[PDB]
Design a protein around this motif. Structure first.
Motif, PDB file in Angstrom:
ATOM      1  N   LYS A   1      70.325   4.177  92.363  1.00  0.00           N
ATOM      2  CA  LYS A   1      69.370   3.169  91.930  1.00  0.00           C
ATOM      3  C   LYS A   1      69.692   2.724  90.510  1.00  0.00           C
ATOM      4  O   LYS A   1      70.280   3.467  89.720  1.00  0.00           O
ATOM      5  CB  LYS A   1      67.933   3.702  91.997  1.00  0.00           C
ATOM      6  N   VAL A   2      69.297   1.489  90.192  1.00  0.00           N
ATOM      7  CA  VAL A   2      69.471   0.921  88.862  1.00  0.00           C
ATOM      8  C   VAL A   2      68.173   0.239  88.451  1.00  0.00           C
ATOM      9  O   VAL A   2      67.355  -0.152  89.287  1.00  0.00           O
ATOM     10  CB  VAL A   2      70.645  -0.083  88.793  1.00  0.00           C
ATOM     11  N   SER A   3      67.993   0.099  87.141  1.00  0.00           N
ATOM     12  CA  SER A   3      66.787  -0.525  86.614  1.00  0.00           C
ATOM     13  C   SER A   3      66.740  -2.000  86.991  1.00  0.00           C
ATOM     14  O   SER A   3      67.745  -2.711  86.916  1.00  0.00           O
ATOM     15  CB  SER A   3      66.731  -0.370  85.095  1.00  0.00           C
ATOM     16  N   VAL A   4      65.558  -2.458  87.400  1.00  0.00           N
ATOM     17  CA  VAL A   4      65.360  -3.851  87.787  1.00  0.00           C
ATOM     18  C   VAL A   4      64.002  -4.330  87.287  1.00  0.00           C
ATOM     19  O   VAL A   4      63.466  -5.331  87.775  1.00  0.00           O
ATOM     20  CB  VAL A   4      65.479  -4.021  89.313  1.00  0.00           C
ATOM     21  N   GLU A   5      63.437  -3.619  86.308  1.00  0.00           N
ATOM     22  CA  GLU A   5      62.128  -3.988  85.782  1.00  0.00           C
ATOM     23  C   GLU A   5      62.199  -5.202  84.864  1.00  0.00           C
ATOM     24  O   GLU A   5      61.226  -5.959  84.771  1.00  0.00           O
ATOM     25  CB  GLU A   5      61.512  -2.806  85.035  1.00  0.00           C
TER      26      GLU A   5
END
Lengths: 140, 33, 222, 125
Positions: free
Chosen positions: A73-77
């Motif tokens: 997973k990667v940050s997408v905020e």
RNA sequence: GAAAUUGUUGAAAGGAAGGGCAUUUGAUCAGACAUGGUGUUUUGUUCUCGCAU
RNA sequence: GGAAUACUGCCAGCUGGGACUGAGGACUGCGACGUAAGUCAAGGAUGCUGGCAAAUGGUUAUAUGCCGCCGUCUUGAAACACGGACCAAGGAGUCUAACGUCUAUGCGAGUGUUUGGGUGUAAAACCCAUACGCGUAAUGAACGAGGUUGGGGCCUCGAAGAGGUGCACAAUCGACCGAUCCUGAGGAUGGAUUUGGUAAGAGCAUAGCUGUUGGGACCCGAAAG
RNA sequence: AAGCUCGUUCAGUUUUAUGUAAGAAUGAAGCUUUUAGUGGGCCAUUUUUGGGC
RNA sequence: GCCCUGGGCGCUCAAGCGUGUUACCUAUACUCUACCGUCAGGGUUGAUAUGCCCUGACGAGUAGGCAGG
């Protein structure tokens, strides 16, 4: 026609699909490419990004059942995906907005991709099977 | 016109035996001595 | 006119009252079953503690299922099965336990399997495959009103009442059993197990008295 | 049978049987289907002798069969008779005595539930 | 102007085939006959009252 | 001393993966949610999307996976037993006399016009006097043209039911008469042993399937006077 | 098939009477009358016959 | 206990023998559902008809019988 009693219950997504997860497409021109999940659309499709600048895959609608989930997973905020909508894909050659919006979306995700070592090149490489592979055993 | 099956489709199961609601709301199926 | 709402309200109130009556009856039946089981367990405990053997009551309810086909059936067992409503294979019905019936099972034992059911199995059968006989027609049991109309005079007004009457073998056992259409049962989900079905259960077969194992067999055949 | 009037009478009696509860309609409807042999003639003498039954002074007699005149009787009390077919001699005798001969439809319109109706069958042996 | 039977041409395959269950290949065909269905202004015996639309 | 766990049975416990099924057709019904509007997995599928000017699919040939000559015959279901070179046409319970059951029509204690006469738009169509085919008062048919027990139905009273009533006949005994056994004012006359019906008719004509004998008789054939 | 009329009456169904008054269980009618066809042996079994049949 | 004298390929700590324990193969058998028909029950006309329907059960078969084309 009788009054059929079948309400349009909202879709329930499997727990293995979370925003910012790395997706793999099994069908389409981009089959075998690695993509990043962003948002779920009202039409039961998944809004995803390559990102375009990394592997050339633009923002596209995809179906969950044709997508293999991955733990990475990667940050997408920080990406404001609220702008995109089902109407954004209607057609009734590339549109001008399709380039600027894609670049803006990828600008807020290339840094996150580069944060994790080897993630940029990992996404740039298309996924494919090999001799002796056992997908059922593999966790993917 | 269609035979609803009890056990499954809890909605029809509540049509018969109104005590099913109390049974499910009190865990009587696993009542301790 | 004012009938459209008045009749609806009146029937809804009557249905609500009947629902409360059925709810209290079902609660009483459940409490009675729990108390009976607890008392039986306590009696067994007392017998064990007092160094005396237990005197369990005789099984007052049995269930019989047809296991063999019509072909080559001798006339006497065939007539017994016909009078027991066990016509088609994989069909069964509840029968009172008496010497008049035990001696009947003795003759059809080679072609049938039977035992002592339980509350859970009886309830599952009545809820799933429970079919009532009305005006000679086969009507599935789906509404308490359907059962109440046919057995209201006998004090039965719900599926739970029918199950209670069947399990307890009460005074109206005859009528309760007759109203129930013969149960249509599928083959066991896990199979008969034994390689040779046509043998006595006590020697690795199938047909014959198996007591509690009939409950397990029915659930697989349900 | 093939008579259109008989078919209409059968339709009417079938409608009455399931909507009037009274068995009188059912009996007449069943007797209508009876064949010719099963519906032997009913003589006016048989009606007269049965008309002396206690409590039958003002009762009405219905004869699903055929009413035939008789030469063994003379005095005919005033009465009302309903039947599918009435012979000329029997019709004259009934009318002469001050009575009335009517079709089954009139009987059904006057006695929907079979009130005051009496059914007389004919000998077969 | 029909069948057995036979002559020109086109498809076929290797002590035998026509027959039955499901599919591909080669050829061939009804191929949906959709002619449909939604609301206005322009000109003549102000106009969609209705005609070409 | 203590729990744990194997095993059995329950959950009107939870949570998934996969296969078929969409059957009914504007709401009426049983239920859950809700303080109410209203909602619901609650007497049968809906919402969205994509490819298309050959679309889907049909007949046929050929190759692949599996399966596999006819009617009559003895009759133990049978091998054995006759017929078959192929094709167009023909081919067989059809007609009739006398006796019925069954179904319908007209009349009805009557029924039947058509051997004939009248008449005719001419083998067509419409009417009828004699008698005449069958029964109708017979085995002089009334003790009463039957009470005793039942009875499709009818109503008085009351829903369940009670009373009477009685249609064909269910069973019995009696009434009249052909008749059975005494009697002798010739067989009168009175009973009576049993007898075969009447009770308060139920039949005639036509049309349709159908039963059996006789005519060639479902069709071809059988040593001859 | 053909009329009636009883809705109940029945059973190749199972033990005590001594074969039954059964208010024991289980399942779920009768007289008629005329109307086509129906004259076989056999596999196994039963009664268990003697010396192969 | 088994051996000796007395379906094909092959099999030999069997792929032979007896037995115990699980899984799997599939009949027109069984269980759920789509359709035709027969059989049974019922609604039906102050008009919705030898019709329009609802519910259930049943589906082998020579001669023979009945019904519908």
């Amino acid at each position: 026609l009788k009054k059929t009693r079948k309400a349009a219950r909202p879709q329930k997504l499997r727990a293995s699909l979370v925003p910012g997860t790395v997706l793999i497409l099994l069908a389409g021109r981009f089959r075998g490419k690695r993509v990043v999940y962003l948002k779920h659309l009202e039409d039961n499709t998944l809004l995803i990004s390559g990102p375009f600048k990394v592997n050339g895959v633009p923002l596209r609608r995809v179906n969950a059942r044709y997508v293999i989930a991955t733990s990475t997973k990667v940050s997408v905020e920080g990406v404001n995906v609220e702008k995109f909508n089902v109407e954004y894909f209607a057609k009734e050659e590339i549109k001008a907005e399709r380039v600027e919006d894609q670049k803006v979306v990828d600008k807020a995700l290339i840094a996150e991709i580069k944060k994790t070592p080897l993630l940029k090149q990992y996404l740039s490489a298309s996924f494919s099977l090999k001799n002796g592979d056992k997908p059922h055993m593999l966790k993917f | 016109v269609l035979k609803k099956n009890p056990l499954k489709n809890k909605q029809v199961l509540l049509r018969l035996n109104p005590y099913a609601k109390v049974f499910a709301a009190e865990k009587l199926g696993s009542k301790k001595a | 006119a004012e009938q459209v709402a008045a009749e609806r309200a009146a029937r809804k109130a009557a249905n609500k009252e009947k629902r409360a009556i059925i709810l209290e009856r079902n609660a009483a039946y459940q409490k009675e079953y729990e108390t009976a089981e607890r008392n039986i367990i306590q009696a067994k405990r007392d017998a064990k503690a007092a160094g005396s053997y237990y005197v369990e009551a005789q099984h007052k309810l049995v269930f019989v299922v047809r296991i063999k086909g019509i072909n080559k059936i001798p006339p006497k067992p065939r007539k017994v099965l016909q009078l027991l409503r066990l016509t088609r294979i994989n069909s069964g019905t509840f029968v009172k336990v008496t010497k008049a019936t035990l001696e009947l099972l003795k003759l059809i034992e080679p072609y049938v399997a039977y035992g002592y059911p339980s509350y859970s199995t009886i309830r599952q059968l009545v809820y799933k495959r429970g079919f009532g006989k009305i005006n000679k027609q086969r009507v599935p049991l789906s509404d308490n009103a359907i059962i109440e109309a046919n057995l209201g005079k006998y004090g039965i007004l719900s599926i739970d009442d029918l199950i209670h009457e069947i399990i307890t073998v009460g005074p109206h056992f005859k009528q309760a059993n007759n109203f129930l259409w013969p149960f249509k049962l599928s083959n066991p989900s896990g199979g008969w197990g034994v390689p040779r079905k046509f043998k006595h259960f006590i020697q690795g077969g199938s047909f014959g008295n198996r007591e509690e194992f009939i409950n397990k067999l029915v659930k697989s055949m349900n | 049978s093939d008579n259109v009037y008989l078919k209409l009478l059968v339709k009417l009696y079938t409608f009455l049987a399931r909507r009037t509860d009274a068995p009188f309609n059912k009996v007449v409807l069943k007797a209508l289907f009876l064949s010719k042999i099963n519906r032997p003639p009913v003589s006016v003498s048989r009606i007269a002798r049965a008309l002396k039954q206690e409590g039958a002074a003002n009762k009405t007699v219905v004869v699903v069969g055929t009413v035939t005149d008789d030469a063994r009787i003379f005095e005919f009390p005033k009465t009302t008779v309903a039947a599918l077919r009435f012979t000329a001699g029997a019709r004259a005798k009934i009318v002469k005595a001050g009575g009335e001969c009517i079709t089954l439809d009139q009987l059904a319109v006057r006695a929907p539930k079979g009130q005051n109706t009496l059914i007389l069958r004919g000998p077969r042996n």
